[PDB]
Each structure stands twice: as structure tokens, then as C-alpha cells.
């Protein structure tokens, strides 16, 4: 069954140890963008640009939640 091999791949990719930050996601994201912003390689630049756009999209979500009272 292919369904069993698909879940086995998802379990294989699931890392152990969620177990370090208790509702500290905003500060951990700010510190992550700061360390990656000083990178030069395209792997560090692409990840920095990716996290910057995620932070910009977060501002649209807060404006939508603000209009929802």
C-alpha cells in the first residue's frame, strides 16, 4: 500500500524534541531573521528573503484580525 509508505516518509521527516519555546514564537522569529540577514551565500539570502516576506504578510493578517474586532 502506497498510503503506508507516504506516512512512513512523514514520520521519517518528523524531528524529535515545540520543546524549547513556550509561546515565544515571535521573539524566536526576530532572532532568526537577524542571524540570517548577515549571510552571503544564496542559501542564506533566499532564506532571509523568505522570512522577510513572511513577516510582511503577517502585517496583513493583523489588519484583517483588527477589522474582525
Amino acid at each position: 500500500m502506497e498510503r503506508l509508505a507516504d506516512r512512513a516518509l512523514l514520520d521519517f521527516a518528523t524531528p524529535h524534541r515545540d520543546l524549547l519555546r513556550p509561546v515565544d514564537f515571535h521573539q524566536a522569529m526576530q532572532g532568526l531573521r537577524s542571524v540570517l540577514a548577515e549571510g552571503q551565500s544564496p542559501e542564506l539570502r533566499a532564506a532571509a528573503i523568505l522570512l522577510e516576506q513572511m513577516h510582511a504578510d503577517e502585517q496583513l493578517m493583523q489588519m484583517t484580525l483588527h477589522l474582525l474586532h
Partner: protein, 112 residues
């Protein structure tokens, strides 16, 4: 140089894992490429990116990543399931069958 703390490394691995669950295989590879650039020895990051490469239709790259984990971690059965899925995307169904057979042998040998 540019170092990442163990808490920051696992937080970057968590973000790559959350993108993989949301069907964002491309974003998962980009985040985990940065993790494995600063820390190429991160074993959990390679397993997560390997599955992200499989879901991104990059079988030619996931094959070399699956063969990498076999040489550095030969006691994991999941490495052969990824190689079976990688070689299956490369059009090598004969090689993918042997990799899946080796996966069933290690998976059964670890359970009793």
C-alpha cells in the same frame, strides 16, 4: 563567522517542518538549505529536506541525498524508502524495486 545556536537551529528546522506539512515543499527546501549550509552535519535536517525534495519532484537531487544518509547512517530503514521514492521519480523502476526491497528487510529486522 555566522553561527547558529542549537535553539536557533532547531527553530529553523521546525519552520522547515511546518512548511512541509502545509504542502510547501519549495519553502521547506529553502529554509533547510540554510540550516544544512551552516550545519551540514545536522542529521535531522537532512531527513526533513530529503522528504521535502521528494515532494518537490527533485528526484535527481533526492537520490544523492538518500545515498548520503545511507553512508553516514546505514542502520535507518527510512533511508532506503527515500531512495526507492527518489529512483522511482528518475524513471528507474527496476532500481526503485530493489531499494524498496531493502527497506522492507531493515524495517522488519528492527521490529519483533
Amino acid at each position: 563567522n555566522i553561527t547558529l545556536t542549537k535553539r536557533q537551529q532547531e527553530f529553523l528546522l521546525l519552520n522547515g517542518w511546518l512548511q512541509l506539512q502545509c504542502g510547501h515543499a519549495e519553502r521547506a527546501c529553502i529554509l533547510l538549505d540554510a540550516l544544512l549550509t551552516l550545519n551540514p552535519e545536522h542529521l535531522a535536517g537532512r531527513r526533513c529536506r530529503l522528504v521535502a525534495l521528494l515532494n518537490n519532484n527533485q528526484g535527481e537531487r533526492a537520490e544523492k541525498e538518500a545515498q548520503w544518509l545511507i553512508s553516514h547512517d546505514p542502520l535507518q530503514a527510512g533511508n532506503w524508502l527515500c531512495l526507492s521514492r527518489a529512483q522511482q521519480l528518475n524513471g528507474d523502476l527496476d532500481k526503485a524495486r530493489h531499494a524498496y526491497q531493502h527497506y522492507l528487510e531493515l524495517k522488519d529486522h528492527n521490529e519483533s
